[PDB]
Amino acid sequence: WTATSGSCKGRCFELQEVGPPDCRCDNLCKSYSSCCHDFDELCLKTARGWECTKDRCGEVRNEENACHCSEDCLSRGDCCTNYQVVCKGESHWVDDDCEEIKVPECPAGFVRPPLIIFSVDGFRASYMKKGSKVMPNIEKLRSCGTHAPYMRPVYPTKTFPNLYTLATGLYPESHGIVGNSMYDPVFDASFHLRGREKFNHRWWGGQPLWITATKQGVRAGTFFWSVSIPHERRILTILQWLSLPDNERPSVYAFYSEQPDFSGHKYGPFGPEMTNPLREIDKTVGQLMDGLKQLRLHRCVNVIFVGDHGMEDVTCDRTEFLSNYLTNVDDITLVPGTLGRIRAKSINNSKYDPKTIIAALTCKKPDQHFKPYMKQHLPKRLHYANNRRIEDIHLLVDRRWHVARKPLDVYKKCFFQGDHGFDNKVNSMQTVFVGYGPTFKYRTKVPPFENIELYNVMCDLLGLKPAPNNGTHGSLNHLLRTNTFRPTMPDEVSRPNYPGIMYLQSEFDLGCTCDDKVENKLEELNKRLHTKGSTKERHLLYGRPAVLYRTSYDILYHTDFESGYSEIFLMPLWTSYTISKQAEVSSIPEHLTNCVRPDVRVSPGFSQNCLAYKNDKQMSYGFLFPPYLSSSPEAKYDAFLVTNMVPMYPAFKRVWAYFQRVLVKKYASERNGVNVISGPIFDYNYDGLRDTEDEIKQYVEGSSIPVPTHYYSIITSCLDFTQPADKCDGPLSVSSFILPHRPDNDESCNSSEDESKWVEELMKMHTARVRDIEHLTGLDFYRKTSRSYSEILTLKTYLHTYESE
Ligand SMILES: *[C@@H]1O[C@H](CO)[C@@H](O[C@@H]2O[C@H](CO)[C@@H](O[C@@H]3O[C@H](CO[C@H]4O[C@H](CO)[C@@H](O)[C@H](O[C@H]5O[C@H](CO)[C@@H](O)[C@H](O)[C@@H]5O[C@H]5O[C@H](CO)[C@@H](O)[C@H](O)[C@@H]5O)[C@@H]4O)[C@@H](O)[C@H](O[C@H]4O[C@H](CO)[C@@H](O)[C@H](O)[C@@H]4O[C@H]4O[C@H](CO)[C@@H](O)[C@H](O)[C@@H]4O)[C@@H]3O)[C@H](O)[C@H]2NC(C)=O)[C@H](O)[C@H]1NC(C)=O
Ligand SMILES: CCOC(=O)c1cc(-c2cccc(Br)c2)[nH]n1
Ligand SMILES: [Br-]
Ligand SMILES: [Ca+2]
Ligand SMILES: [Cl-]
Ligand SMILES: [K+]
Ligand code: NA
Ligand SMILES: [Zn+2]
Numbered sequence: 189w190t191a192t193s194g195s196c197k198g199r200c201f202e203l204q205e206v207g208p209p210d211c212r213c214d215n216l217c218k219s220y221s222s223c224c225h226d227f228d229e230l231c232l233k234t235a236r237g238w239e240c241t242k243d244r245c246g247e248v249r250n251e252e253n254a255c256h257c258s259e260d261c262l263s264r265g266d267c268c269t270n271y272q273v274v275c276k277g278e279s280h281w282v283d284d285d286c287e288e289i290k291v292p293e294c295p296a297g298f299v300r301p302p303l304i305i306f307s308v309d310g311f312r313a314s315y316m317k318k319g320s321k322v323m324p325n326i327e328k329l330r331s332c333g334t335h336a337p338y339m340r341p342v343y344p345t346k347t348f349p350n351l352y353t354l355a356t357g358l359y360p361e362s363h364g365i366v367g368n369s370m371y372d373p374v375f376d377a378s379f380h381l382r383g384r385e386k387f388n389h390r391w392w393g394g395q396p397l398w399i400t401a402t403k404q405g406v407r408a409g410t411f412f413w414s415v416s417i418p419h420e421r422r423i424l425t426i427l428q429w430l431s432l433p434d435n436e437r438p439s440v441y442a443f444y445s446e447q448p449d450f451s452g453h454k455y456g457p458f459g460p461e462m463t464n465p466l467r468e469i470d471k472t473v474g475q476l477m478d479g480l481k482q483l484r485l486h487r488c489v490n491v492i493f494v495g496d497h498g499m500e501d502v503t504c505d506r507t508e509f510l511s512n513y514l515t516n517v518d519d520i521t522l523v524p525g526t527l528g529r530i531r532a533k534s535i536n537n538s539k540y541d542p543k544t545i546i547a548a549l550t551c552k553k554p555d556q557h558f559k560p561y562m563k564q565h566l567p568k569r570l571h572y573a574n575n576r577r578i579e580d581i582h583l584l585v586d587r588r589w590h591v592a593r594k595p596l597d598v599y600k601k602c603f604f605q606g607d608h609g610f611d612n613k614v615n616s617m618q619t620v621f622v623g624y625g626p627t628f629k630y631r632t633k634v635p636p637f638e639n640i641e642l643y644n645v646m647c648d649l650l651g652l653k654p655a656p657n658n659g660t661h662g663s664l665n666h667l668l669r670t671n672t673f674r675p676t677m678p679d680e681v682s683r684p685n686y687p688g689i690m691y692l693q694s695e696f697d698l699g700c701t702c703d704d705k706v707e708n709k710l711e712e713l714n715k716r717l718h719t720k721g722s723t724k725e726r727h728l729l730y731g732r733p734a735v736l737y738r739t740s741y742d743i744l745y746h747t748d749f750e751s752g753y754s755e756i757f758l759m760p761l762w763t764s765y766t767i768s769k770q771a772e773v774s775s776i777p778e779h780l781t782n783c784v785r786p787d788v789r790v791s792p793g794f795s796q797n798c799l800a801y802k803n804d805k806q807m808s809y810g811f812l813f814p815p816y817l818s819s820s821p822e823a824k825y826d827a828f829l830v831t832n833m834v835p836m837y838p839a840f841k842r843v844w845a846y847f848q849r850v851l852v853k854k855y856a857s858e859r860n861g862v863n864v865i866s867g868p869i870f871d872y873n874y875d876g877l878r879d880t881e882d883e884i885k886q887y888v889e890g891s892s893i894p895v896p897t898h899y900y901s902i903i904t905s906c907l908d909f910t911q912p913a914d915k916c917d918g919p920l921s922v923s924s925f926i927l928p929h930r931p932d933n934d935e936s937c938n939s940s941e942d943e944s945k946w947v948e949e950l951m952k953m954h955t956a957r958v959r960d961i962e963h964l965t966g967l968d969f970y971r972k973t974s975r976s977y978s979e980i981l982t983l984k985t986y987l988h989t990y991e992s993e
Contacts, residue, residue, distance in 0.1 A: 189208070189209045190208060190209050190210075190211055190212075190220075190221070190222045191209045191210070191211065192211045192222070192223070192224060192225055193211065193224075193225065194210060194211045194224050195224055195225070195226055195230075196211075196213035196223070196224045196226050196227050196230050196231055197226070197230060199213040199224075200213055200230055200231040201213065201214065201215055201231065201410075201425050201428070201429075202214050203407075203409065203410060203429070203436070203438065205410070208222070211223065211224035211225075212224070213227060213231065214410055215410050215412065215413050215414060215417065215422075215425065216410065216412050216413070216414055217414070218414035218415075218416060218417070219414045219415075220387075232417070232421065233252060233253065233254050234254050235250075235252045235253050235254055236250075236252075236253045236254060237254065238254060238255060238268060238269075238420045238475075239268050239269075239270050239274075240257040240267075240268045240270050240271050240273075240274040240275055241274065242274065244257040244274075244275075245257055245274065245275035246258070246259055246275070249261075254268075254420070254421075254424075255267060255268035255269075255271075255424060256268065256271075257271055257274070257275060262482065264431075265427065265428055265430070265431025265483070266424070266427075266428055266431075267479075267482060269423065269424075269427070269474075269475040269476075269478040269479040269482070270475075270478060271482065272478075272481075272482050273478065278481075280474065280478055281325070281328075281474070281477035281478050281480075281481050281486060282324050282325050282328055282474060282477070286328065286331075286332035288630045289487050289625065289626045289630070290626070290669075291626060292487075292488050292626040292627075293484075293487040293488055293626070294485070294488035295483075295484060295485070295488070297434040298434075298488065299434075299439075300439055300650065300651060301488055301489060301490050301625060301626055301627060301649070302430070302438070302439050302440065302441065302485075302488070302489050302490070303439065303440045303441070303489070303490045303492070303646065303649050303650055304426070304440075304441045304442075304443065304476070304489055304490070304491050304492070305440070305441065305442045305443070305492045305494065305646070306443045306445075306473065306476070306491060306492065306493045306494070307351070307354070307442065307443065307444050307445070307494050307495070307496065308444075308445045308447070308448070308469060308493070308494070308495050308496075308620075309347055309444070309445060309446055309447070309448070309449035309450070309495075309496055309497075310447075310448050310449025310450075310452045310453075310495070310496070310497060310498065310499045310608065311448060311449075311469075311495035311496075311498070311619055311620050312448075312452075312457055312495075312498035312499050312616065312618070312619065312620075313337070313338035313339070313495070313498055313615075313618035313619055313620055314498075314618075315448075315466065315620070316330060316335075316337075316620060318458075319463070319466045322463055322466055322467045322470065323466055323467075323469070323470040324470065324474075325470045325471075325473040325474040325477060326469070326470050326473055326493065326622070329473070329491065329493055329622045329624045330493075330622045331631065332624065332630070332631060333491075333622055333623050333624030333625065333628050333629075333630075333632075334622070334623040334624070334628045334629045334630075334632045334633075334634060334667050335621065335622045335623075335632075335633060335634070336620075336621045336633075336634050336635065336636050336637060337633070337635075337636060338618035338619065338620065338621075338636050339494070339495070339618065339619050339620060339621040339636065339637060339638070339639055340612055340613075340618060340636060340637070340638040340639065340987070341353075341495075341496065341497045341498075341612050341617055341618070341619055341639055342359060342360055342571075342612060342638075342639060342640065343360070343570040343571075343572050343611060343612040344360070344366075344367060344526070344527050344572075344609045344610075344612075345497040345498070345526075345608050345609050345610060345611075345612055345614075345617040346367060346368045346497065346608065346609050347368060347449070347496055347497065348365045348367075348368050348381075349365050349366065349367065349368070350496040350497050350639065351496050352365045352392070352396070353639055353640060354494065354496070354639055354642055354643070355396040355397050355398075355643070356394040356395065356396050356397070356643055356655075356657065357394075357640055357641070357642070357643030357644060357654065357655075357657030357658055357659040358393070358394045358640070358643075358657055358658055359571040359572075359640065359658050360571075360572070360575075361571055361572055361573060361574045361575045361578065362393065362394065362574070362575075362658065363392070363393045363394045364391055364392060364393040364394075364575065364577065365379075365391065365392065366572075366575050366577045366578050367523065367527075367529070367577075368381050368609075369381065369523055370391075370577050371531075371577070372391075372576065372577055373576055374576060375390065379391055394655065394657070395655035397440070397643060397646055397647070398411055398440070400647065400652055400654065400655055401439070401440055401650065401652060404652050404653065406439050406440065406650055406651075406652060407436075407437065407438040407439055407440075408438055408439075408440050409426065409429050409438035409440065409441040409442070411442035411444075412442070412444070413443075413444055415446065419445065419468075419472050420472075420475065422443055423443070423472065423475050423476050423479060424479075426441050426443060426476070427476075427479045427480075427483065429441065430483060430485060431483065439650060440646075440650060443472075443476070445469060445472070447465040447468065447469055448462060448465040448466060448469065448499070449496075449499065449608075450465075451464075451465045452499040452606040453499075453604055453605075453606045453607065454603075454604065454605060454606070455605055455606065456499075456501050456605035456606045457498070457499040457500060457501060457606055457616065459605065459606075473493070476491075487626065488625075488626065489625055490623070490624070490625030490626065490627050490628060490649050491622075491623070491624045491625055492621075492622070492623055492642075492646070493620065493621070493622040493623075493624070494619075494620065494621055494622075494639075494642070495619030495620040495621075496619060497608045497609075497617055497619055498608060498615075498616050498617045498618050498619050499606050499607075499608050499616065500587055500588060500606065500607060500608060500610065500614070500616040500617065501588055501605065501606065501616075502526070502588055502589065502590060502604065502605070502606060502607040503602060503604070503605060504590075504598055504602035504603075504604070505602070506557070506588055506589045506590060507589070507590040507591065507592050507595075507598055508556070508557050508558055508585075508589065508590070508591050508592075509591075509592055509593070509594060509595055510522060510549075510591070510592070510593050510594075511593065511594045511595065513548055513549055513552055514545065514548055514549075516545075517593060517594060518533070519532065519533050519534070519537060519540060520532065520533055520540075520545070520593070521533050522591070522592070522593045523579070524590070524591060524592045524593065524597065525585075525590055525591070525592075525607065525609060526585055526589075526590065526607050526608060526609030526610050527582070527583060527584065527585055527591075527609050527610070528558060528560075528581075528582065528583025528584075528585060528591045529578070529579040529581070529582060529583070530545065530579055530580075530581035530582075530583070531579045531580070531581070542562070542580055542581055545560075545581060546560050546561075546562065546581065549583070550934055551934070551937040556937070557585065557586040557589040557591075558583045558584065558585045558586065558589070558591050559583065559584050559935070560581065560582070560583055561581075561582045561583075561584065561935075562580060562581065562582075563578055563579070563580055563581070563582050563874070564874040564897075565928055565930070565935070566582060566584070567926075567953055567954050567955075568871075568876065568898065568926045568928075568954070568956060568960055568964070569613075569926075569954070569955060569956050569957070569960060569987065570611070570612070571658075571876055573874040574873075574874055574875045574876065584610075584611060585610060586610075587610050587611075587614050587616060590607070613955075613987075613989045613990075613991060614991070615991045615992075618636075619639075621637075621642075623667055626669070627649055627668060627669055627670060627671050628667060628668065628669060629666075629667060629668065629669050630669075632667070634664075634666055634667050635982070635986075637663070637664060637982075637985065638985065638987075640657070640658045640659050641659045641660070641663060641664050641985070642659075642664075643657055643659055644657065644659040644661045644664065644673070645664050645667065645668070648668065648671045648672070648673055649671060651671070660959055660981055660984065660985050661673055661675060662674070662675040662977065662978050662981045663978070663981040663982050663984070663985045664982075665978040665981075666978065666979075666982065672978075675977065675981070676977075677734075677968065677971065677977065678734065678736055678968055679734075680734040680735060680736070681734075681735060681736050681737055681738055682735040682737065682738060682739050682740070682741065684732075684735075684741055684742060684743040684752060685740075685741070685742045685743070686742070686743050687742050687744075687789040687790065688789060689788045689789060690788065690789060690791075691786070691788045691789070691790070691791060691792070692788070693786055693788070695792055696786040696792050696795070697792065697797075698784070698786065698792070698795060698796070698797035698798050698799065698830065699797055699798040699799030699802065700784035700785070700786065700797070700798035700830065701782070701783070701784070701798075702780070702783035702784065702785045702828060703779040703780060703783060704780075704783065704785065704825065715747070715822075718745065718746065718747040719745055719746070720745065721745040721750075722745075723745075723747055723748075724745060724750055726766055726914060727748070727749055727750050727764055727765045727766050727863075728750050728764050729766065729863045729904070729913070729914065730863070730904070730969065730970045730971065730972060730973050731970070731971035731972030731973070732750075732752065732764075732971070733752070733762055733865070733967040733968060733969045733971065734967065734968040734971055735752070735761070735966065735967060736966045736967065736968055737878070737966045739754060739756055740754075740755045740756060741753060741754045741755060741756075741761060742755065742789070742790065744760075744787075744789065744790075744831060746813075746823075746826040746829075747819060747820075747823040747826060748765055748813060748817070748818055748819050748823050748826060748827070749763055749764060749765035749813040749826075749832075750763070750764050750765070751763045751764070751812070751813075751831070751832070753790065753831050755790075755794045756881060757868070757870075757881070757894055758794065758795065758796050758892065758893050758894070759796070759831075759833070759834050759835075759868060759893075760812055760831070760832070760834075760867060760868075761867055761868075761965065761967065762865055762866070762867040762965075762967060763812035763813050763832070763865065763866050763867060764863070764864070764865045765813055765817075765863075765864055766861065766862070766863050766864075766913060766914055767817055767852055767853070767856040767861060767862050767864065768856065768861040768912060768913070768914065769856055769857060769860050769861050769912060771817065771819075771853070771856060773816050773817065773849065773853050774816060774817075774818060774824075775816070776815050776816070777821075777824075780815075780824070780828060783828045784798050784809075784828060784830050784833060785825065785828045785829050785830060786829075786830055787829045787830055787831040789831075790830075790831055795830050795831065796809075796830055796833055796888075796891075796893050797830075797891065800888045800889060800890060800891035800893060801835075801888060803889050803890055804888050804889035804890075805889075806837065806889075806931065807835050807836070807837060807888050807889065807895070808835075808836055808837065808838050808841060809833050809834065809835055809836055810833075810834055810836040810840075810841055810844050810845070811827055811828075811832050811833060811834070812832055812834055812866045812867065813826075813827055813832050813866075814827070814848035814849070814852065815827040815828065816848055816849045817848070817852060817853075834868055834896065834899075835888050835893060835895050835896065836929070837929065837930065837931040837932075839930060839931055839932050839933050840899075840927075840929055840930060840931075842933065842939075842943060842947075843927060843933075843943075843947055843950065844899070845943075846943040846944075846947040847901075847947065847951065850943075850944070851947075851948065851951075852864060855903060855905075859905040859906075859909055859913070859921070860905060860906065860909045860910070860911065860912050860913065861905060861912040861913030861914060862903050862904065862905050862913055863903070863904040863905065863913050863914075864901060864902070864903055864904075865901065865902045865904075865969070866899065866900065866901045866902075867899070867900055867965065868896035868898070868899055868900075869896055869897060869898035869899065869900055869926060869961075869964045869965060870883070870884060870894065870896055870897055871897050871898065871964055872884060872885045872886075872897060876960070876963050876964060877963055877964065878963070878964055878965055878966040881894070895929070896929050897928065897929055898926050898927060898928050898929055898964070899926075899927050899929055900924065900925065900926045900927075900956065900961045900964070900965070901924060901925055902922065902924045902958055902961060902969065903922065903923050903924065904920055904921070904922050905920070905921050906918070906919075906920065906921065907919040907920055907921040909921075917974075919975065919979065919983075920970075920973070920975070920983055922958060922983055922986055922988075923955065923988035924955070924956045924957065924958055924960075924961060924988075925951050925954050925955055925956050926954055926956040926960060926961060926964065927950070927951065927954050928954065933946075935950065936949070936950050952990040955987060955988050955989065955990065956987070957984065957985055957986060957987045958970075958983070958984040958985075958986075959984045959985050962984070969984070970983065970984065
């Protein structure tokens, strides 16, 4: 109930919203059906249009007009945006040459540059180039300010998840808006795009920018606009708030456009009907900049032009139907479309089984256009699992396609030519970023970055301390002229032991064998210096990684590689080695096929044993430094040390072996040498964080050898590939992966073929940022380089995507 009977006289677009059943005059009142009787009349004036004309200049103030061309309008702060152009002979902002804004040029009383966030639904990244002729205003922002060629959205590439990620710096799994459509089993409630429940505060986790602003004493202009409020009125409102007294005026503002998403859905991303929406958006930007220029605020305000997601070609005929796969289709609930989410229709049916459903959806048709997953098996880079709102069963749908339950759903709902929501690595999903203003750099291109990073920068722009978030603060320092945030490396928590030879061979009762008892002064000081760390500078190029938690581990040196070996997990946390362009692949000799050797620096009690592997019918083992890349027959022995051994399912060994035998050398050729750091990851509770030992659900049968959920690799070289990895002068180049450690290869439909037809594609699917690996391991890499820390932070957030240009 609202007693809609009060008035909006002198209250139009009030900054503090008021409490029921009193009536409202704020820019959101329409969405709650709660405006005062006179809101339309007083607040949504339209009379006479949105522009001055020659004959309107110097007119009598008629309070009924939408905007004004009378003499007093400037001091009142309510002229039409073109007033000075038409009536005082001024030029439009877009027709002015651009000039570096070295310092805020603000009116007296402004304590900081204001920030205006101009967000646009469905603005595909390629529109910047492809629509550049019809967007002169946006194009001046882009080329004069700072721009990325695209910005990576979060998965799923839907509107609400992405807007709230922009607002909070959080993955959807942490902020709670995990789709446009949701069921919370704890609440027993549903969230929908249409309706009432989406307004309830309990859906919305983390701390959005406007709350962060308020708590720290920065005023925020009510971010959100009712859909029927035309765009011209939104701009005039923002411009009016900017004319308020110093004590009342907001410092941060938000404009949102429903275009071009709304049109893209009907016509496809490049429909010829798409030119007009792009022209209208540019006109809107033009109105804002002209209005800022009028108020002498155009060299004072920081403007962010930002998209939530792109748009892809999708039609009705490109639908897959679960009814073509499942006999039991009526006992399941599907969240449909560009992603699939499956749960039981009734919790009272115990004959439901996720295992049988996954199996029936696995590699069933030659060209199948989705892939099912248990959510914990999704690529770690999606960060899409740790929320009770995300169903155990997920479908990743191919770009250009849809998934529905039964065909009736599609035709008892062809309408659409465009949709979004697919995997966030997909080109057509990429969106935009432009920063323009005194705090941004001038005429600067920056590399692609992820939208999770913006919350930090918008806090920086405003002098705020960000709430705890998933950005890496400092990683976007290169976009900014000043207000940079200068972070420090986290302190190492655990120091390593450096064990020498302390144990005799006979003390080890591991059930391991090796054909190795084959017998010199020149070459004995030699292997000792190797064990003391004489080639460490060759294999540990960026310093040893820091261990950021409390644990007990040893550093182990060898001719070919260096490891940090965990006495708690009985395996290395990390193994580091360098492979030069010139290096040669050999084979594992026959005498050494099943050779595992005791490590006389590590106690039997801190070692794995061979017997456990023999007893465990499911689990085999592999090596972190690959025997294949030994620098000599004599050095090859080090690769068979029990302290280089990790638990591996036979099916994963196929993956691991091909990566190690074929791909490492390939990358050394292509990149002029590589540095490699490999290791295990444990994430049994799929939270994206390093598991403590009490979190491990699986051990190699009858032992305390814990089983990894994933294996990572970080592959580094010189960005200038004319210089070899070990002798690099400048910036670095990185790619990494986090491969799930699976007992089968069900994920790769062509895995009964030769490894050269499926392994590399699998690795690409599971590409990762070094930062992802850090969360999952509690290590901090790149500790000792010649590069600035901000630059290293950027490198750590890089994701190698494997999409073409
Ligand atoms: C991305 O960035 C984010 C932000 O930094 C990272 O997430 C943080 O991770 C922390 C570690 O997991 C976590 O810290 C915990 O805080 C608990 C108190 O939690 C509240 O406080 C914050 C601050 O106000 C608040 O934001 C939280 O809001 C969550 O919950 C509601 C839903 O109930 C949502 O509205 C909201 O969206 C958000 O949900 C998300 O987070 C929770 C995790 O808290 C998930 O479960 C959800 O799925 C969802 O993703 C909270 O209201 C505190 O209780 C924890 O302490 C427990 O564990 C420690 C170990 O140190 C132990 O000392 C204690 O004993 C304690 O355990 C007790 O409870 C257990 C369970 O009942 C029980 O097993 C024990 O026996 C004990 O009795 C913990 O310190 C922090 O909350 C989140 N913050 C957010 C916003 O998510 C995230 O890690 C980053 N991601 C990556 C990949 O890096
Ligand atoms: C759903 C309609 O959305 C709106 O009206 C709107 C959204 C934002 C916004 C979005 C993301 C980050 C920030 Br910070 C602000 N501002 N206005
Ligand atoms: Br939002
Ligand atoms: Ca974990
Ligand atoms: Cl959804
Ligand atoms: K075995
Ligand atoms: Na297979
Ligand atoms: Zn949309």
